[PDB]
Design a protein around this nucleic acid. Structure first.
Ligand SMILES: [Mg+2]
Ligand SMILES: [Mg+2]
Ligand SMILES: [Mg+2]
Ligand SMILES: [Mg+2]
Ligand SMILES: [Mg+2]
Ligand SMILES: [Mg+2]
Ligand SMILES: [Mg+2]
Ligand SMILES: [Mg+2]
Ligand SMILES: [Mg+2]
Ligand SMILES: [Mg+2]
Ligand SMILES: [Mg+2]
Ligand SMILES: [Mg+2]
Ligand SMILES: [Mg+2]
Ligand SMILES: [Mg+2]
Ligand SMILES: [Mg+2]
Ligand SMILES: [Mg+2]
Ligand SMILES: [Mg+2]
Ligand SMILES: [Mg+2]
Ligand SMILES: [Mg+2]
Ligand SMILES: [Mg+2]
Ligand SMILES: [Mg+2]
Ligand SMILES: [Zn+2]
Lengths: 126, 154, 109, 60, 81, 102, 96
RNA sequence: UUAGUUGGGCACUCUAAAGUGACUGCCGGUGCAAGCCGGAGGAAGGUGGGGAUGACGUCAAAUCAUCAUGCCCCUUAUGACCUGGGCUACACACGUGCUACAAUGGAUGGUACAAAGGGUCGCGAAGCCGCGAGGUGGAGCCAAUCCCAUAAAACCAUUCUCAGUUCGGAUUGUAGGCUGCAACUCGCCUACAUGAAGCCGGAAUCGCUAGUAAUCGUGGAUCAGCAUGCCACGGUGAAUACGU
RNA sequence: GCGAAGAACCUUACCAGGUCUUGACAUCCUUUGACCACUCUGGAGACAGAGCUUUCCCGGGACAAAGUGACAGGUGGU
């Protein structure tokens, strides 16, 4: 229950939320290991810190795809969409921090005549 | 000739452990080639030396280190007919902090010790005691700007 | 010491590579047949340890004997008339790489 | 010197390594795609005409 | 052939010198195959190898065994600047 | 110290022609008292109706010198291409100095 | 116990032809699952635009192929005949 | 079940067809009107991000060598076949790139996270052998099924301790592998040993405004073999814009 | 790092040597209709000399054998 499938870059994160103690499960693996950076760890709890429910629910995460930071962003959007399903009363609170928005930034495409997205080969006058 | 003028500015996220804005803006300044782990880790461990060597507060001492090297005046040269005159001018609030971190890290690389870990931590100690290269350069900016006080507004 | 002076402050795995004809990988076997740990300072090995290494290193080729053999091979090609002889005798790149640009490491400055 | 060259490529060579590919319409040796067996020029000029099934100009 | 399946020797060149052992360096051999490794049977013989426009004679020694014919027939004519 | 590069097409770059181009464009040194060493790109081409063309590019740091001419024979064009080039050096140098001196 | 594979450059022919099978198959072999939209496979061909010079100016072409899937659980004696009779036009390739 | 495995179900992702959605739509102020500033709703707000799309014309711009073609020219040769060589030369000058000049680093051991593509005279697994490049073997796959195919930076431990060095790898001697009828001129890769210039680059000069620069890997066309080039894919991920 | 999205032979358009002249590639001539391929010898190969076979199918045919013409062929120039 409480399905809040969220996305970031190339990552898709399906999150089912249940009341509990606060344990986070990612692909049948402890979340201390999957996310090594404590800096990447705080952003996971932003939807859980605007509303005081951090030590009340357990998240079961089955993410697939994207880089290690990619799942961190996609799991933040994952819980917020699922948490908003728990009670619509949280919408003004989460909207203030811009947590419902799905980030639209994606890596560009390479262009012919260019060495990347916008890099231009060195110009020589003469 | 073109361009509309003012533009938006980037946001900063509050880092864990040492919740601050200068710390987050300092991590991104000394990062190279988008390696957050390398640059972030040396800063977090550097604060340990700040506590062990002279333990006052890792959050503090770093503070007045910044407020001792941030310049108050600035020079923005302009070319007049015949000769170029270095015009003194104030420094905005945003560039106040930017010119501090850049001066801190440019001279932290030139300190000349074994690791960047020690070099950055030691440099802020000297700044917190009104000493070092970072403090030295700000005085050069002030001395030059106050030497040309004549055509400040004129 | 072991054919020629080797550094003292350095390590035996690293110090051995200071003699012509030995390298990093080969220093693994001569330190294995000698039955002595890799992480040992040079100014710590006893005579019994140093004796086995000199006995082991005797079987492998070393400086001088190897220095003269390679030069002898180079000489053999100079007057036989092989193509590589003119490259060796004129200093131009010997193997299959071009010469219009970038041959300075062999031609010189 | 092209009519001789095209005829030479048709007949079997001494060994399998002498064989190569040539454009069917015009006959230039360089830049031939063996999906269509056309060179880069005949491919463009004839894809515009709507005669290569599936092929269409690619925006993305 | 730079593999175990080698060595590679040209047929018409190999056969010609094979029957020339009776000559014992009495006839020059005029051949084009530069891609043949020099055999022990070739030792003492003189062969004329095509260098792109003409034939250049080389006397085979023992030291030349295992090499190709073309190694001793330089092609590009360089004389400095 | 100027380094030349003549791209002779539809013509042969004989040594007398090379000397003529080198010595005529070499007098520009008097004007621009420090000419940093740079490469000169010279192009020559002749039509079927006996007309000669010369194109010169001398990329000095802030001075992009060009001139292109069409005349009867090859030598007239080279002698008449100095006037177009000398004007630009005199134009660019005296523009900088006198304007900053209001 | 019969599967159908359909591929086409243009889906308009594909989708219309696929529907024809579904209606005919259910007449005899009522056990017919809906068409499955298998992923499309794409290929690009960048080509120099000019003839002689100008490698920096190019042109790109594509070839997108669409695929479908039809599954039947319990066949009928006429189901194969019905599938055989229904001959789709060109531009679509069938495969039992 | 050793493993989403097997039985079972489309719940969720997913793939692809049809639709909704963004249109200054609404509100407030300003203006006479165009419009401008701000705010709410929303995933997205002011042509949202990026492509395809290049007006009359200028440079007698490039291409008779992709193809076509007026005129001129050759025709026991300026046409046709074969072997060998060359287009890979080298006192030198210029343009474009790759690798470095180390401690945010080198070396050793463990381990996590992708997207986009190719495969039938084709991809080629397990197994066994070899230090290695590689060899035998033949499974499965005309493919959302099988293979290519273990992603690398990153993370965690030990060691090295500021030196032309455990940095850098050119150069060279020997011994091998692979394609091909054939690797000398003139291919790529592996093992051992040799160990060069180089410690941030003068005058000058180039690129880039956000998933951009920077950095790290991956794939495809041409292809028996051969890319530091080209065309695409994703991972991590900045600083600054007072102003004309 | 432009044609070249791949120069060891081919590619190749250049050079040395060795060769051919209705020809390597198409049309109309005339006799057979399959024509070859292969093996051996001289061969650097192209090519020179011999043998096995060339079975066409349906008066038609495309190619091939044979010599002739009209002719072909030029990455020769603008
Ligand atoms: Mg250009
Ligand atoms: Mg090479
Ligand atoms: Mg080939
Ligand atoms: Mg004059
Ligand atoms: Mg209004
Ligand atoms: Mg709004
Ligand atoms: Mg438009
Ligand atoms: Mg022109
Ligand atoms: Mg031209
Ligand atoms: Mg023509
Ligand atoms: Mg070339
Ligand atoms: Mg190393
Ligand atoms: Mg070789
Ligand atoms: Mg080695
Ligand atoms: Mg030195
Ligand atoms: Mg150093
Ligand atoms: Mg390849
Ligand atoms: Mg380019
Ligand atoms: Mg040839
Ligand atoms: Mg016969
Ligand atoms: Mg015969
Ligand atoms: Zn073509």
């Amino acid at each position: 229950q409480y399905y809040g499938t969220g996305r970031r870059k190339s990552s898709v994160a399906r999150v089912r939320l249940v009341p509990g103690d606060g344990k986070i499960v990612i692909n049948n693996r402890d979340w201390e290991d999957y996310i090594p950076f404590a800096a990447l760890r705080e952003v996971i709890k932003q939807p859980l810190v605007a509303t005081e429910t951090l030590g009340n629910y357990d998240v079961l995460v089955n993410v697939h795809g994207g880089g290690y930071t990619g799942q961190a962003g996609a799991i933040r959007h994952g819980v917020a969409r699922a948490l908003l399903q728990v009670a619509p009363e949280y919408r003004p609170a989460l909207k203030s921090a811009g947590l419902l928005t799905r980030d639209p930034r994606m890596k560009e495409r390479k262009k012919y005549g260019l060495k990347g997205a916008r890099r231009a080969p060195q110009f020589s006058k003469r | 000739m073109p361009r509309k003028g003012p533009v938006a500015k980037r946001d900063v996220l509050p880092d864990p452990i040492y919740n601050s804005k200068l710390v987050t803006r300092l991590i991104n300044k000394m990062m190279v080639d988008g390696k957050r782990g390398k640059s972030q880790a040396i800063l977090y461990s550097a604060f340990d030396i700040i506590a062990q060597e002279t333990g006052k507060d890792p959050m503090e001492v770093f503070e007045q280190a910044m407020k001792n090297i941030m310049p108050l005046l600035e020079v923005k040269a302009r070319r007049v007919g015949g000769a170029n005159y270095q015009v003194p001018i104030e420094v905005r609030a945003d560039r106040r902090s930017t010119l501090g971190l850049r001066w801190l890290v440019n001279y932290a690389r030139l300190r000349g010790e074994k690791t960047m870990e020690v070099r950055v931590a030691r440099e802020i100690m000297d700044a917190a005691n009104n000493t070092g290269a970072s403090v030295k350069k700000r005085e050069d900016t002030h001395k030059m700007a106050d030497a040309n006080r004549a055509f400040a507004h004129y | 010491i072991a054919g020629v002076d080797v550094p003292r402050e350095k390590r035996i795995v690293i110090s051995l590579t200071y003699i012509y004809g030995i390298g990093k990988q080969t220093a693994k076997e001569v330190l294995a047949e000698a039955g002595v740990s890799e992480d040992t300072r040079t100014r710590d090995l006893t005579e019994e340890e140093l004796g086995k290494i000199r006995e082991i290193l005797d079987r492998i080729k070393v400086e001088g004997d190897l220095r003269r053999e390679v030069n002898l091979n180079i000489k053999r090609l100079i007057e036989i008339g092989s193509y590589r002889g003119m490259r060796h005798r004129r200093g131009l790149p010997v193997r299959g790489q071009n010469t219009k640009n970038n041959a300075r490491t062999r031609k010189g400055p | 010197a092209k009519k001789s060259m095209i005829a030479k490529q048709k007949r079997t060579p001494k060994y399998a390594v002498q064989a190569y590919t040539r454009c069917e319409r015009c006959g230039r040796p360089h830049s031939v795609i063996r999906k269509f067996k056309l060179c880069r020029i005949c491919f463009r000029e004839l894809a515009y005409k709507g005669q290569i099934p599936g092929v269409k100009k690619a925006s993305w | 052939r730079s593999l175990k399946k080698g060595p590679f020797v040209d047929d018409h060149l190999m056969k010609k010198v094979e029957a020339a052992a009776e000559s014992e360096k009495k006839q020059v051999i005029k051949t084009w195959s530069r891609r043949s490794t020099i055999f022990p049977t070739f030792v003492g013989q003189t062969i004329a190898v095509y260098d792109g426009r003409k034939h250049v004679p080389v006397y085979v020694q023992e030291d030349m065994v295992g090499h190709k014919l073309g190694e001793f027939a330089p092609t590009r004519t360089y004389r400095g600047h | 110290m100027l380094k030349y590069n003549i791209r002779g097409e539809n013509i042969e770059v004989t040594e007398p022609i090379r000397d003529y181009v080198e010595k005529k464009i070499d007098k520009l040194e008097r004007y621009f008292t420090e000419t940093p060493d740079a490469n000169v790109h010279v192009n020559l081409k002749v039509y079927s109706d006996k007309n000669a063309k010369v194109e010169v590019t001398i990329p000095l740091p802030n001075l992009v010198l060009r001139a292109e001419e069409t005349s009867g024979d090859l030598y007239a064009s080279i002698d008449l291409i100095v006037d177009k080039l000398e004007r630009q050096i005199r134009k660019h140098k005296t523009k900088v100095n006198r304007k900053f001196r209001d | 116990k019969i599967r159908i594979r359909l591929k086409a450059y243009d889906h308009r022919i594909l989708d219309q032809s696929a529907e024809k099978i579904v209606e005919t198959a259910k007449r005899s072999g009522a056990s017919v699952s809906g068409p499955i939209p298998l992923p499309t496979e794409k290929s690009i061909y960048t080509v120099l635009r000019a003839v002689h010079k100008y490698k920096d100016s190019r042109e790109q072409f594509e070839m997108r192929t669409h695929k479908r899937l039809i599954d039947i659980v319990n066949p009928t004696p006429q189901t194969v005949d019905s599938l055989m009779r229904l001959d789709l036009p060109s531009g679509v390739d069938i495969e039992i």
